[PDB]
Nucleic acid binder design. Sequence first.
RNA 1: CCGAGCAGUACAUGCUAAGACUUCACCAGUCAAAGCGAACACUCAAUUGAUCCAAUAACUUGACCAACGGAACAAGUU
RNA 2: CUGGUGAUAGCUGGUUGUCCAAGAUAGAAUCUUAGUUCAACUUUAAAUUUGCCCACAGAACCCUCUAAAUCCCCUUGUAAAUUU
Lengths: 95, 106, 122, 44, 120, 354, 50, 51
Amino acid sequence: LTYFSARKGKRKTVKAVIDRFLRLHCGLWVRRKAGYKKKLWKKTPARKKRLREFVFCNKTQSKLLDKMTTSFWKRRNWYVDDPYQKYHDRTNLKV
Amino acid sequence: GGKSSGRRQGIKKMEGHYVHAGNIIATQRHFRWHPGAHVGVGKNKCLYALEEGIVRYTKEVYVPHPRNTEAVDLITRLPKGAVLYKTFVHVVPAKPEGTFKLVAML
Amino acid sequence: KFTRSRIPEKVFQASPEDHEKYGGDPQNPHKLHIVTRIKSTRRRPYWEKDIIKMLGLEKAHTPQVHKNIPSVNAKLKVVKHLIRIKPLKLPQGLPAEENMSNTCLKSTGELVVQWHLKPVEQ
Amino acid sequence: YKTKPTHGIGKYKHLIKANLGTDYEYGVLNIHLTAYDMTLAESY
Amino acid sequence: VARKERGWRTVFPSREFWHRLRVIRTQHHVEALVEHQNGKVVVSASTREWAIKKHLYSTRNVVACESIGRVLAQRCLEAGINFMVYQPTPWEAASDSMKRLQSAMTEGGVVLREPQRIYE
Amino acid sequence: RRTPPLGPMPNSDIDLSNLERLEKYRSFDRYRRRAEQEAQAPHWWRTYREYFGEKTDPKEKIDIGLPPPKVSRTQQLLERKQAIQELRANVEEERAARLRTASVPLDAVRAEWERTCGPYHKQRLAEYYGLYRDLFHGATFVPRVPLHVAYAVGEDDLMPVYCGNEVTPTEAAQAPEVTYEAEEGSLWTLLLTSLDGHLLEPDAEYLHWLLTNIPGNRVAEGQVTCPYLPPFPARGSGIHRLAFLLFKQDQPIDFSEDARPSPCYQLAQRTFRTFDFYKKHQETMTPAGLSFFQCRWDDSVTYIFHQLLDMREPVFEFVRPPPYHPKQKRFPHRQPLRYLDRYRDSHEPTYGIY
Amino acid sequence: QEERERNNQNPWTFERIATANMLGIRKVLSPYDLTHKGKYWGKFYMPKRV
Amino acid sequence: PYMTREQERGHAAVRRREAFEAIKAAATSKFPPHRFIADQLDHLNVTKKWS
RNA sequence: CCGAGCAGUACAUGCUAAGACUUCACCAGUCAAAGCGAACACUCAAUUGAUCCAAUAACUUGACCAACGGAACAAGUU
RNA sequence: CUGGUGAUAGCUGGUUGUCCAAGAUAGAAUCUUAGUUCAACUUUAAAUUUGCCCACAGAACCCUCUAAAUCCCCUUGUAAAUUU
Ligand SMILES: [K+]
Ligand SMILES: [Mg+2]
Ligand SMILES: [Mg+2]
Ligand SMILES: [Mg+2]
Ligand SMILES: [Mg+2]
Ligand SMILES: [Mg+2]
Ligand SMILES: [Mg+2]
Ligand SMILES: [Mg+2]
């Protein structure tokens, strides 16, 4: 990670995180399952069913990806007809 | 080899524990505990709760299914008067299925 | 392997010779204990260290009163080798509101309610 | 469970089975039924 | 909407029912029982009673088994029982006496399969 | 560590010495019959009956019925054996039974059934519906006197009520026809109650018919203490049960305290408790017959609440408890995307301050 | 040996202390010592122990 | 023992429950202390002198 | 000290969805009520391999990556 | 020799005033075992309500049998515990 750029003097963003993970504005990170396109002929339908699911990340992994991206990806977006628009906020969450 | 680690299989919910539907009660390599009332069995002989309630372990008479050849062939050679026993795990439901409530006055 | 010790129930069954030896009475058991720690919790298992903290027996040679009930006695059966157990004696009865400032516990287990600090005239 | 009084309730192996002729009982006997008719030999 | 006792997959017979048809045939008599899952018997029909015995030449033949079902089905309708499960053994199911008993129950208006529980 | 058993072991009686000379089950049916016998006996260890079996009191239920009839067994057996011999004497009955073409008359069997063991089956059947549990708080009685009640539907058909059979309120809009065998000079008292029909007090019951001091079988001559009222089970409230109680009186009884105006369309006066009613009349009155049926809701129930009862018909619905979901966590690790939908109230988008 | 155990004048024995865990003595003892009662140490047997 | 297991049971449930409620009261009363305006103005006395 | 790097039977070995287990992390792995749609969560202790990339209209496929959490490709000798 | 050069070094050595407080020994992966990441443990702040000790009851048959115990766990003693 480049903490200070050599031309602008500001933190840079790792493009490996952006191409793999989706960040919800609430603070959660959504990822894919490693191996959902590999050797599907030997995997049971129940196993394949949970491979093609979008899953969240835990406390440590989410904080890791936050330090690897800049504030441009932590902003609130208002895309028209966004499939994940309803997932940017938490409801009935206590503590 | 022999570098294999333990599978962490055993009793997950003890006697008197409050469980919900779908909760796994016990994981086992073989049928150490047999499924009782409101208890299902998966592919890997995994016992899961079918109802929300309290888990109980009892000793019940084991009656094999007629199709099961190995278990039926075992009871045909038993001395007359002998009865096989095995440990069964039951879930006693705590809440009723539903209640009738007034919705309108027509 | 060193583990916890299960004391057989036969140990805590007083014989008739013991009642005339310590002065107890099985028909009228005492109500309260006087537990005093006389041994260090150092070099002892951690579970025995906790029970001493539960009973408020941190400082040694400091009397503490507890109730003669099976649950309290259950904890005492685990650290019985670190404490001295003595029944509480009440020659004048339970302390009253006017006797709270005049009580005194003697080494014999008697809790006197009139501590005058004066020689007996008898 | 072993510490429970109901230990060994599920035991069944001791109920399942795992020649010399003594002076009081015959060891092995073969009963031969020879006849020209097969029906009578099988029936007897 | 009443829950059935699911489970008992490793033993026989099952317990996932509200009512069960249990047929007991001894050396001399044949008896059929309709009992709830809790063990309570709702209605019964046996050849030991004089009412059925007085018309039966033999209480241990196929005719006796068939005649029990016709009387039992009549009593089930009066009692209000229309659905019950039957859990026979492979040899009992292939027997001619049980096939006619089941025929009498079906012709008597009783269904040998309970409707599925409504979960939602 | 080991602990001695608290009682005899299951297979302790089996002798392990002569294992070869012990008879085997040799079949599944033989083991199954023996296995069930041991399952019905109490054991010192935990059993399925302990937690799921219906708890019962050690005190046996008291009997408040009529004394059992007195029959000479020796005379009965001689005639019964003789009849079977004549039935077996016929060569046509044997051939018909051997050819599996014989059949018995259903009407004749029930005629003898109702006289010998009909009352006994009815007591067991009534116990299943909890009629003894609710009406008499567990007290039981054998219905020595058969009761035949049938509702008039039209002019040619009748709806018999034997025990708990389904009957619609439309068929029960009018008082049924009550027929029962009785001697002259005896006094009877009919009673019809709705156990589950009450809308306010679960314990209380609704009175639908009360006829007292009925002379013999002439039901019409009986005093009309409370006019007949058709059952009115609310819609969506399930299935109700109404029980016909047939009492036998030894001496004339005064029902001034239980008298109700004609007609009685007030549910507060229709409130009735069988336990308290029989409690103060048990001295000279004893139940003799029993009949009951199950009733659902139909369109005729709407007419009862609006016109007869002059009230709005209540509607009930079977409501299930909400599904269980664990406490929501800030980071639902490895949970699918649909995790957040389980804890969301509305399905419509929100915008906050925007 | 049985006579020696019966007439022994010492009120304190190995078996009594070991089973009752007096003075926390099981911390320096062995699980087998609850049954050996001090008569067996290692592979050696002491007949003089009661 | 003075009392048996059955007699002892439930004889201290009220006091035990009330003692823990006092723990909750102190635990959930944690808040920053009040900030007074007199304290801020008292620092002007560091330059107080004689006329 | 003995094995595994498969094979056989299915062709709903379809689609979805409560609640749980989890090889002490992660990754990965496992069980599963109900519902929809059909009929009247396959056997098997292990029987396996991530990302990038490449191929493909698409569905999908690709390593004795066996040093088996794998560097795209590098041995001796002083 | 000068410059890149303040090369790099999982290695060696060093790392400056006062006082108080809490504080030690499960593991997994790694061209990895002189390192590092994660977990465990430890620290601080915050929210919350149970935590620990533990009465019965309860946890398997086998290859025939067999130990100290452990899990679970109302009371009770106590004041910790979980979450962020
Ligand atoms: K490697
Ligand atoms: Mg884990
Ligand atoms: Mg490796
Ligand atoms: Mg690994
Ligand atoms: Mg350097
Ligand atoms: Mg310190
Ligand atoms: Mg490597
Ligand atoms: Mg507790």
